[PDB]
Write an enzyme that holds these catalytic residues in place. Structure first.
Site, PDB file in Angstrom:
ATOM      1  N   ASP A 213     -11.772 -10.740  -2.857  1.00 19.02           N
ATOM      2  CA  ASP A 213     -13.060 -10.113  -2.595  1.00 19.02           C
ATOM      3  C   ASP A 213     -14.034 -10.315  -3.747  1.00 19.02           C
ATOM      4  OD1 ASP A 213     -10.645  -8.651  -1.471  1.00 19.02           O
ATOM      5  OD2 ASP A 213     -12.220  -7.834  -0.179  1.00 19.02           O
TER       6      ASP A 213
ATOM      7  N   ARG B 260      -5.984 -15.784   2.407  1.00 17.44           N
ATOM      8  CA  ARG B 260      -4.964 -15.464   1.415  1.00 17.44           C
ATOM      9  C   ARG B 260      -3.823 -16.474   1.377  1.00 17.44           C
ATOM     10  NH1 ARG B 260      -6.358 -10.134   3.393  1.00 17.44           N
ATOM     11  NH2 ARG B 260      -7.292  -8.979   1.654  1.00 17.44           N
TER      12      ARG B 260
ATOM     13  N   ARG C 174       0.852  -1.180   0.000  1.00 22.48           N
ATOM     14  CA  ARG C 174       0.000   0.000   0.000  1.00 22.48           C
ATOM     15  C   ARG C 174       0.890   1.233   0.000  1.00 22.48           C
ATOM     16  NH1 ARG C 174      -3.440  -4.419   2.046  1.00 22.48           N
ATOM     17  NH2 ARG C 174      -5.343  -4.022   0.844  1.00 22.48           N
ATOM     18  N   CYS C 175       0.738   2.079  -1.016  1.00 22.73           N
ATOM     19  CA  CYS C 175       1.432   3.357  -1.084  1.00 22.73           C
ATOM     20  C   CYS C 175       0.397   4.453  -1.295  1.00 22.73           C
ATOM     21  CB  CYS C 175       2.496   3.364  -2.194  1.00 22.73           C
ATOM     22  SG  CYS C 175       1.900   3.607  -3.863  1.00 22.73           S
TER      23      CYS C 175
ATOM     24  N   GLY D  97      -9.132  -1.262  -5.936  1.00 27.00           N
ATOM     25  CA  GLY D  97      -8.374  -0.042  -5.716  1.00 27.00           C
ATOM     26  C   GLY D  97      -7.154   0.044  -6.609  1.00 27.00           C
TER      27      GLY D  97
ATOM     28  N   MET E  16      -4.751 -40.120 -15.415  1.00 26.85           N
ATOM     29  CA  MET E  16      -5.927 -40.767 -15.980  1.00 26.85           C
ATOM     30  C   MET E  16      -6.585 -39.812 -16.980  1.00 26.85           C
ATOM     31  SD  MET E  16      -7.640 -43.120 -12.990  1.00 26.85           S
ATOM     32  CE  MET E  16      -8.133 -41.690 -12.030  1.00 26.85           C
TER      33      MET E  16
ATOM     34  N   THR F 129     -17.845 -36.299 -14.799  1.00 32.42           N
ATOM     35  CA  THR F 129     -16.797 -37.296 -14.948  1.00 32.42           C
ATOM     36  C   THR F 129     -15.437 -36.655 -14.729  1.00 32.42           C
ATOM     37  OG1 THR F 129     -15.881 -39.033 -16.375  1.00 32.42           O
ATOM     38  CG2 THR F 129     -16.600 -37.017 -17.455  1.00 32.42           C
TER      39      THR F 129
ATOM     40  N   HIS G 225      -5.923 -44.122  -8.854  1.00 34.73           N
ATOM     41  CA  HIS G 225      -7.158 -43.602  -8.284  1.00 34.73           C
ATOM     42  C   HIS G 225      -6.926 -42.540  -7.212  1.00 34.73           C
ATOM     43  CE1 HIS G 225      -8.030 -47.454 -10.154  1.00 34.73           C
ATOM     44  NE2 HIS G 225      -9.288 -47.065 -10.264  1.00 34.73           N
ATOM     45  N   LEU G 226      -5.699 -42.024  -7.081  1.00 35.33           N
ATOM     46  CA  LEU G 226      -5.478 -40.835  -6.266  1.00 35.33           C
ATOM     47  C   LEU G 226      -6.229 -39.629  -6.815  1.00 35.33           C
ATOM     48  CD1 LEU G 226      -1.649 -41.238  -5.618  1.00 35.33           C
ATOM     49  CD2 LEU G 226      -3.426 -41.325  -3.875  1.00 35.33           C
TER      50      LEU G 226
END
Ligand SMILES: Nc1ncnc2c1ncn2[C@@H]1O[C@H](COP(=O)(O)OP(=O)(O)OP(=O)(O)O)[C@@H](O)[C@H]1O
Ligand SMILES: Nc1ncnc2c1ncn2[C@@H]1O[C@H](COP(=O)(O)OP(=O)(O)OP(=O)(O)O)[C@@H](O)[C@H]1O
Ligand SMILES: Nc1ncnc2c1ncn2[C@@H]1O[C@H](COP(=O)(O)OP(=O)(O)OP(=O)(O)O)[C@@H](O)[C@H]1O
Ligand SMILES: Nc1ncnc2c1ncn2[C@@H]1O[C@H](COP(=O)(O)OP(=O)(O)OP(=O)(O)O)[C@@H](O)[C@H]1O
Ligand SMILES: Nc1ncnc2c1ncn2[C@@H]1O[C@H](COP(=O)(O)OP(=O)(O)OP(=O)(O)O)[C@@H](O)[C@H]1O
Ligand SMILES: Nc1ncnc2c1ncn2[C@@H]1O[C@H](COP(=O)(O)OP(=O)(O)OP(=O)(O)O)[C@@H](O)[C@H]1O
Ligand SMILES: O=P(O)(O)OC[C@H]1O[C@](O)(COP(=O)(O)O)[C@@H](O)[C@@H]1O
Ligand SMILES: O=P(O)(O)OC[C@H]1O[C@](O)(COP(=O)(O)O)[C@@H](O)[C@@H]1O
Ligand SMILES: [Mg+2]
Ligand SMILES: [Mg+2]
Lengths: 761, 761
Positions: A156, A291, A78-79, A110, A562, A517, A650-651
């Site tokens: 946001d 965040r 922020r400036c 902003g 897969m 799927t 199948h992970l």
């Protein structure tokens, strides 16, 4: 065509939305890929003001190995100097000293307002700068126009012109990880979980979180609660208890207010619930956690896509075109003028300042209002005094996909709301032939949102074999509509039942296919329900694998994904993880291409980057299997790197649905039921439903811009039944982005970027 | 031997510590394995009081598929009836109606206090019950003694007699997942993260969280801050900022107080930080999240172990033996009398009520005081006015292991505190030969805690080949001690240097080995640093895989784990996931055993359970590979189940360290450095260091009860150098628990349970 001879500046400002690093990486690499010079402006507008050391030229390795990092390696600050012309003139000076006529600003509302005011004054600032004597008149006629391409990086989603912003999905990942910690446990005693999100200005995160978790109550600044909500909420929780539901969830935004300006604190709601109900009430405040963490898969893909399209829009922009924001409305990339988006943001802020306050929620966007209406409808069973003789059966067909349950839940509630007699058939077409039809109520789908897989059984068996049994059971149960939630087998089976309308009168019923799927191989949609979950689980495994080399050993990992013949999962996962190559069926490759990629990997591996990652779709090649690629890379990389293999089986399958998948399946389940009810009224005739036109059997879409209903008979032309995938897939253009980000010189004349569009009022 | 003819009641009460379901499952299955009847008492002491429907007899499948669930399927409730004799008599009645002379109570401090008072009055309650006429005198002389085996299930760790409680590790997992969301991002701007934990009475969770995260400040009720801490904290944050550290972490317990009784709120510390520093301060309150999520791997193993030992202690308990609490001090199972533990808890509570308040922290346990001192030592660099001529080099040897960095961080800080000159060498013995020696400072290890793998390089190369270069570099840099953090290769290399002392005088230096490997194959310890992380990653993969069938199809998964010939990782992972079988090298198996297991799986798969899981260590068998087992299970399971395969490669390797591994590596790194300083002072004579005795080269242990130091030469007898594992491993008795939990009738006469031990004052 190339943007040679010109320089691009990239900066990040505002809250460090995770996925900013993906956008910065894509911006940098596209900028130096097309020959332009890229300058990294550290700390955002701060380093823009002070300049000097804070502006450094980027090389390809400057943005290496950052895509999985949250926050922003460029840094944000922020400036207040950029607010005033004193510092903004210094910013314009420092840009001119490096010949940076092109600026990409990644930040919130902003940030983009400051960028808009910076363009609008760029000519006046240069005039005052040459007048004061810090730049000659020559060297100021050049650089007379500053090109601004904005990227909305914030949790946001307060920027009104844009539907989805970078970091919203990952903030939702954090929120739902916390909520799933509560809900997935065996709920033992009566307790109330009050979640406080940081949506101080915008309540989008609060809203989508409530929708994804099935919150009992929601406090958002867009729609403050009516007077006497104290009693209304406490009674809602009371009957919730009487049902036996042991957990209540209250999502309160930071900006929660009443009909007056008085804010509602999370502590107040806590003490209120404790006093009247006595439930164990504890307030969970995420704070900085929203965040935090890695960017989600969605955030990495979309940030990379928008960063690339930002650079491309920044090169094709003449002195006349205005500052734009590169965003996606739906799945379609689009550019919106920065001025109009800033104006809408100001209008909504003024409206929210008790001007048109009840009518401010519509100006927030149709997605917000629709999401809030869907949430309230599904939250509490209102009495459907309307009734209709219609009845409908919900099928789950094919493999299980994360988010089928969310779709079934929304379909059940919405159908009950319209007075339909909703049935659920277990095991899909098998049960429909076997008469496993079960009339369902509102509470029978309670808590189905977060459950992965399918609560109804899934079977792949197509209906053609047991067609006499299916029509017999449709006749017995009087089924007038058929909602089939599933993969390619779902579409193919609905196609078979439609084709069999010629033979069986009972199959002249409205049908709807919800594509669900892992492979994303269902024609008529861009995103099958649960493909997002699979991609997220795939990258997380790949990130783990890539992190296992531990920054010192030079190692390449062959990771087999897969997806059948459909390469979508492999390619997007490669983008998300920065894979060197994603071999897929739709891009056939021979040994010449393999040697090109292997030599490319060896050269890359001699530089600073030590962890290579190539993905292979399981069915991309008949002979060049995962073992083949392992042998190739390990042999040719001898003396440079080692090779390892990991078949993600199948992970990628059994995970809980990601928040995107829950909200997505929730919404299209509602829309499928709306469309079913409308089509059933459109088709009811002479005392019966007779649906025989091809448009009465559609796949619910999201094909380019919004939800679509593509008739299955029309989709049959563009369907490769042998490979069980569509013939023309929207995502093949993302291969070019993958290859470009991996230093492959590919002429991407086939990539199409979103054109300018005015805001939709 | 078997407990036939007697009934066991199991109940859960208090806050639902995750891992309760694992303990209940093990209690139930051990109880009906040994022939006893097991009764599930729902809602805890509530259902004990009302009884009737709340007491149901359990079968094997009643506790099936709950081990991964947090909370408690039994359900817990707060009842005041058990506080009073009116309800306690009803509870004694309901237990007598089912012949339940054996009660297992899984709960917090209050639960076990109620169990103690219930035993102490069991005879009086039975007398008054027969006097009132609800039970005859006969049927009351039997059941005259009530057997109580307690299990500490709570996130508080407030029960003083016990060192580790069920759910502490998993509550820490939740806390650190939230903290890792903050610390793992690219820290963009100065911000302060204030984390509020629910440690209202006990501040153990706050303390271990602070140690694991390297918190800048800690508010715990055990040691309230001194007067004027306001300024002292704000200055600490100030110099933290001045260092360039962009994130400050403040862990505030809910029960945080000052030296007086006035509580310190998280909001107060926020506003204080905001006012004096201006950092972006947001308070994160976890609330119910700490009890949420899955139980960690450690929690599942230890819950199963203590639940089994609770049942066994409940059957070998005569009328005379007192109520016991089954817990682990160190790695050793132990039984402590319930009365003494409750009495100690009362003593600490009285002390904390401003009686012996400064001396209440010691009565909390030596682990708390030691953890707090280690935390404060590592948190802030105090000025080491002491100095010594000693200098030591820290190596990382072998594969990378999660938690090496935590060990090296602590070793560096602790060595600097004692005035030693600490060096770190990159690439282990390779770097020591190559002279990659870099003197290190306090802040050079900043933020090394949560980073997995190894910041320093790792190499497997043993020092014998390049021993001339190693001795030359030791002479050049004046290395007087050597701290080698690594796996079996670290231990073997240190053994080679010790044996080569006879040839080279320079190698007569004090050496210490910190066992750090995934396999847990290092002799001299029970837990290699980073084995817990690998177990947690492996179960998370296995849990995902087991969820991939989603209750519809019934399928068996062959999951292959790493660990070389050491089977530890497979077996513990099988326990944590409820695997049917964990094939390991140490338990050689032939095709007859495979047919027995496959038929057992087939029979189970015909019952209600649908998801099978058998683990295979990568090197368990020369010929019966994963492909072999896939073919076997899929063939013999034809028409019953399908079989699938997933080789977890480096998915078990690159993850960030779990909180256990961080605290463990932190603590043993301190202890190794303390032992190094003591030994180096004991060996310094004649103006130089000369370490020739075998005791000067030891592996830091944690072998049964507390930390030990085994000389490498003495451990050479019990080392299988061909297979790179110890010959006698403590964990082979856990195979019997795995098999018993998987319905294998195995005579576990070889299992040894903890005997009664009085509390350590
Ligand atoms: N009207 C404006 N004119 C000039 N500069 C502005 C304006 N508004 C904001 N800025 C600049 O942009 C910076 C960041 O803007 P802002 O405070 O609104 O955060 P943000 O972009 O909206 O992100 P987030 O919503 O997540 O907090 C400010 O520090 C300021 O320098
Ligand atoms: N799940 C919910 N979360 C938050 N507010 C809610 C929820 N349900 C109802 N409300 C609020 O309670 C008010 C009245 O509720 P109710 O639905 O019963 O009457 P209504 O006339 O149908 O209101 P409306 O249709 O505009 O939503 C509404 O203004 C709404 O904002
Ligand atoms: N991931 C999960 N897996 C299995 N069961 C779950 C999961 N999440 C919630 N449940 C179960 O669903 C049950 C129903 O209650 P739940 O809180 O989930 O929904 P609800 O608030 O009552 O209704 P609704 O879904 O419309 O919001 C819970 O008792 C819980 O046991
Ligand atoms: N001194 C006691 N005498 C009798 N019963 C007790 C006593 N303390 C606790 N109990 C019983 O155990 C139940 C649980 O107690 P409590 O609500 O205070 O949490 P807790 O025991 O301390 O467990 P946790 O650590 O999870 O918080 C109480 O409802 C009560 O019925
Ligand atoms: N990281 C920390 N977090 C919280 N309190 C701290 C921390 N470090 C020091 N303190 C507290 O500040 C007070 C004084 O700190 P300091 O260590 O600098 O002086 P001290 O005389 O050496 O105290 P100590 O007995 O702990 O060694 C102590 O009461 C201590 O509890
Ligand atoms: N898991 C991680 N991976 C990569 N980098 C990390 C991780 N955690 C922290 N870092 C980085 O390490 C840097 C060191 O600063 P950090 O605040 O995290 O530790 P510190 O508090 O200052 O030191 P200490 O350990 O003594 O508490 C941070 O700037 C951060 O970028
Ligand atoms: O056929 P779909 O609809 O693409 O289902 C996706 C799943 O099916 C697969 O083909 C594998 O399924 P199976 O393991 O049951 O054999 C993979 O593509 C993926 O795991
Ligand atoms: O050698 P250690 O100490 O057993 O390290 C364990 C790791 O090494 C392994 O042998 C694998 O190493 P590689 O990947 O280099 O082949 C596995 O057992 C495990 O991932
Ligand atoms: Mg903003
Ligand atoms: Mg308690």
């Amino acid at each position: 065509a190339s943007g040679a001879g010109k320089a691009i500046g990239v900066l990040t400002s505002g809250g460090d939305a995770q996925g900013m690093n993906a956008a910065v990486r894509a911006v940098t690499r596209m900028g130096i890929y097309v020959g332009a010079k890229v300058f990294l402006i550290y700390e955002g507008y701060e380093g823009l003001v002070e300049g000097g050391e804070n502006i450094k030229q980027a090389n390809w390795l400057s943005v290496s190995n950052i895509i999985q990092l949250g926050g922003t390696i460029i840094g944000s600050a922020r400036c207040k100097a950029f607010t005033t012309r004193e510092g903004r003139r210094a910013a314009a000076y420092n840009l001119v000293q490096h010949g940076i006529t092109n600026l990409c600003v990644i930040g919130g509302d902003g940030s983009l307002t400051g960028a808009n005011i910076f363009r609008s004054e760029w000519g006046s600032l240069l005039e005052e700068l040459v007048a004061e004597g810090k730049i000659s008149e020559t060297t100021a006629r050049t650089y007379s126009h500053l090109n601004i391409a904005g990227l909305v990086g914030s949790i946001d989603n307060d920027f009104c012109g844009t539907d989805m912003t970078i970091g919203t999905d990952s903030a939702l990942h954090r929120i739902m990880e916390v909520i799933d910690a509560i809900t997935t446990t065996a709920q033992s005693h009566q307790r109330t979980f009050v979640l406080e999100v940081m949506g101080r200005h915008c309540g989008y995160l609060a809203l989508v979180s409530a929708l994804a978790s099935g919150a009992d109550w929601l406090f958002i600044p867009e729609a403050p609660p009516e007077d006497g909500w104290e009693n209304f909420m406490c009674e809602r929780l009371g009957e919730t208890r009487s049902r036996g539901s042991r957990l209540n969830i209250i999502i309160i935004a930071e900006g929660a207010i009443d009909r007056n300006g008085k804010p509602i604190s999370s502590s107040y709601v806590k003490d209120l619930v404790v006093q009247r109900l006595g439930f164990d009430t504890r307030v969970t405040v995420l704070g900085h956690v929203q965040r935090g963490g890695t960017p989600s898969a969605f955030d990495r893909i979309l940030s990379s896509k928008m960063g690339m399209e930002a650079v491309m829009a920044l090169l094709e922009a003449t002195p006349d075109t205005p500052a734009c924001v590169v965003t996606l409305s739906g799945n379609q990339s689009v550019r919106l003028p920065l001025m109009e988006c800033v104006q809408m943001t100001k209008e909504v802020q003024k409206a929210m300042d008790d001007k048109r306050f009840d009518e401010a929620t519509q100006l927030r966007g149709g997605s917000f209002e629709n999401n809030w209406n869907i949430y309230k409808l599904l939250a509490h069973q209102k009495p459907p005094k309307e009734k209709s003789n219609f009845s409908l059966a919900i099928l789950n067909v094919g493999a299980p996909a994360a988010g089928m349950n969310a779709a079934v839940r929304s379909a059940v509630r919405t159908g009950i709301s319209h007075g339909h007699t909703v049935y659920v058939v277990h095991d899909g077409f098998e049960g429909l032939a076997k008469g496993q039809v079960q009339e369902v109520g509102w509470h029978d789908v309670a808590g189905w949102l977060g459950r992965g897989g399918s609560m109804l059984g899934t079977k792949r068996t197509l209906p053609k074999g047991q067609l006499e049994s299916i029509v017999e059971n449709i006749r017995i149960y009087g089924i007038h509509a058929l909602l089939v939630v599933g993969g390619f087998e779902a579409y193919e089976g609905v196609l078979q039942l439609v084709e069999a309308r010629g033979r069986y009168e009972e199959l002249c019923i409205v049908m709807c296919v919800i594509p669900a799927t892992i492979s994303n191989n269902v024609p008529g949609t861009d995103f099958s329900l649960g493909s997002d979950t699979a991609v997220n689980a795939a990258m997380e495994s790949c990130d783990r694998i890539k992190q296992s080399a531990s920054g010192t050993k030079r190692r390449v990992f062959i990771v087999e994904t897969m997806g059948g013949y459909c390469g979508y999962l492999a390619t997007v996962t490669g983008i998300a993880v920065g894979a060197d190559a994603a071999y897929v069926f739709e891009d056939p490759f021979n040994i010449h291409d393999l040697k090109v990629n292997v030599e490319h990997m060896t050269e890359k591996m001699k530089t600073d980057i030590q962890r290579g990652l190539v993905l292979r779709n399981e069915k991309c090649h008949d002979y060049y299997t995962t073992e083949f690629l392992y042998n190739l890379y390990s042999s040719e990389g001898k003396g440079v790197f080692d090779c390892r293999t990991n078949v993600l089986g199948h992970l990628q399958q059994g995970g809980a649905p990601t928040p995107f998948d829950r909200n997505y399946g929730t919404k299209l389940g509602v829309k499928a039921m709306l469309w079913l009810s409308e089509k059933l009224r459109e088709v009811y005739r002479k005392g019966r439903v007779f649906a025989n036109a091809p448009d009465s059997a559609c796949v619910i879409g999201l094909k380019k811009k919004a939800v679509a209903f593509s008739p299955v008979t029309e989709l049959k032309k563009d369907t490769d039944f042998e490979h069980r995938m569509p013939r023309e897939q929207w995502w093949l253009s993302l291969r070019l982005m993958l290859k470009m980000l991996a230093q492959y010189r590919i002429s991407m004349a086939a990539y199409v970027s979103g054109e300018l569009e005015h805001v939709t009022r």
